[PDB]
Design a protein around this ligand. Sequence first.
Ligand code: STL
Length: 276
Amino acid sequence: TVFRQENVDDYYDTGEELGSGQFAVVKKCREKSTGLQYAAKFIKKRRTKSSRRGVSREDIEREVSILKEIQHPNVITLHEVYENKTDVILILELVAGGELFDFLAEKESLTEEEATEFLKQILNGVYYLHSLQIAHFDLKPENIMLLDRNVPKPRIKIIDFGLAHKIDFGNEFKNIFGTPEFVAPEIVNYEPLGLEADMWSIGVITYILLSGASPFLGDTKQETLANVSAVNYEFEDEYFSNTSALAKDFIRRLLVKDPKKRMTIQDSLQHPWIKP
Ligand SMILES: Oc1ccc(/C=C/c2cc(O)cc(O)c2)cc1
């Protein structure tokens, strides 16, 4: 599938840089014809077939195909796609309140109400995705953006679909692998992967929201991965002494090694800590 090959600078003006990663940079932009504002994600293309720099066409097209499908208040929306010899440029909805990761650095720990206010929106977004058989595979606070961080109950949107896959056969067997602190044991063990892997990541996020601490984080990446596989975490009293047993129950039913025994997204929405 080919994308718009006119110069993006003919149609948009860029501004503040919002972030950058290994193969991409995101810049605020403004569409000339409407004055409306977006985030432009420039993804570096692979320059040869056998290279390891840049992102393969197959991987770019999968991300674009998934983004084109989704429209939901808690997921980012794709506006347009451009490309040139060096980059594919996603014109994405602008979400200007920053990462949930940076928001948590400020408060350093949330109440259960503040945590469930965020979590309910994350769960609603993931329920939408899983209903479409889309696994995100990279859920973490860096990939949750706030619309406005200066309100009491910030609204969020899930971003960064670069690892997302359609799961039409119940599982994918692809060596998909994200951030060690958040990946499920089946990712660590290179096993077939399904929607269940996102539910583990939600359990990790929930633990972090409530405590300010990461449940499996070791001193090195290999230690973190070994801890995940062994389900080596505990609810430290110093962090969780005033946290309800029902919140711990929610986490405990997500941080389950066997994916078939883990809570599904529907289970999480009916769990008594969440369900109204
Ligand atoms: O597949 C995707 C890949 C990356 C993104 C990132 C979007 C994004 C949008 C913003 O408004 C601000 C931002 O800092 C990031 C969204 C989807």
